[PDB]
Amino acid sequence: GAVTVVSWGGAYTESQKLGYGDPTAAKLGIPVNWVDYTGGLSEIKAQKEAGAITWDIMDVYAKDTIIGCDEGIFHEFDFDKDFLPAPDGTPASQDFFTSMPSKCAVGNILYSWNFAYNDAKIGDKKPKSIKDFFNTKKFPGKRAIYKGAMSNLEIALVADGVKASGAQAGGDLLYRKMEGAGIDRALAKIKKLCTDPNGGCVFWNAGAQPPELLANGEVVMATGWNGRFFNAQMEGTPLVQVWDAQILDYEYFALVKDGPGYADGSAMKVLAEMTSTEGLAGSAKYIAYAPWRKSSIAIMEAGEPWFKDGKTNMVPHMPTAPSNLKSHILMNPDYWADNQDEINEKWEAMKAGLHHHHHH
Ligand code: PRO
Fold this sequence. Notes:
The protein is of the alpha/beta class and about 350 residues long. About 40% of the residues lie in helices and about 15% in strands. It has helices at about 10-30, 40-50, 60-70, 80, 90-95, 130-135, 150-160, 180-195, 210-215, 225-235, 265-275, 275-285, 295-300, 335-355; strands at about 5, 30-35, 55-60, 105-120, 145, 200-205, 220-225, 240-255, 290, 330. Strands 1, 2, 3, 4, 5, 6, 7, 8, 9 and 10 form a ten-stranded mixed sheet that branches. Strand 1 (about 5), helix 1 and strand 2 (about 30-35) form a beta-alpha-beta unit. Helix 3 (about 60-70) packs across helix 14 (about 335-355), helix 8 packs across helix 14 and helix 12 packs across helix 13. The longest helix is centred in the C-terminal third of the chain and has 24 residues, at about 335-355. The protein starts with a strand and ends with a helix.
């Protein structure tokens, strides 16, 4: 019977299907099919409440591993029994480079939220910083920003000169600066950008939209996920990524309880093989997302140039390359799992105010 994996489409799903989905299906004799979504838990909640679950494995935001575990949607793993050791025998829990954020999480890749511009359209002045993203005088034009508050509030505060620490024990220091007053400042900063006649905002929802909007000249700068910009660059689109105040984030799979392949063990078998050392390394032959396992990272580095063409080195494009980390923010999934409802109410009220004050 087939196992249904849910992911984000475009270049990301392609990297997964080619890197580890199709190889897993061929090795196990369990078909592995892919469904596109745009994140969150609303679809799976609807399926679960209807008693009509068709999804088996979901590629999810870090915060949704926590929420989906707490809501009883996802299966709590027994990590070293369920996931494969590294080839040298290292247990999975010691090969994955840090701890899981929830008992329902297993890592796949690391990715960055950053921004890009179209070097052929932007003009002679070139954006170089997150402050430039917000600078409508030096860089007039529309911006594309993510539809949700998550990531936007962080970059807004850093653009306001509030300091992030990057990764360290306890998470990024930025989040202690995101209580009520900090959230209000961040909302005001986004509102300012989106209401400026020399700015304005398109809210993106799907990962392919930022590179497409830049390729077509619809915005001058767009936030997005670095792998989506990387894919467009490798297709010949003259985008340039800016890594100042990039947000380093961690992605996971979760196993859906009571999905079609749950009781018979088929979904778990697929998941264990997809998240193997070889599987996670294989995905990085296609997209600039870093494998979660130390063993997979070592394979990629030893195998450079690791890109599918046997020519392009992948390490300099990774979210975790030292050059790309110089001013990064580390995403905090507990913050968003805990606070997204309260914050989203204010965020959506801000967005509704943009329209009610907009004159055609
Ligand atoms: O779709 C993408 O490119 C990013 C990577 C993790 C999931 N979202």
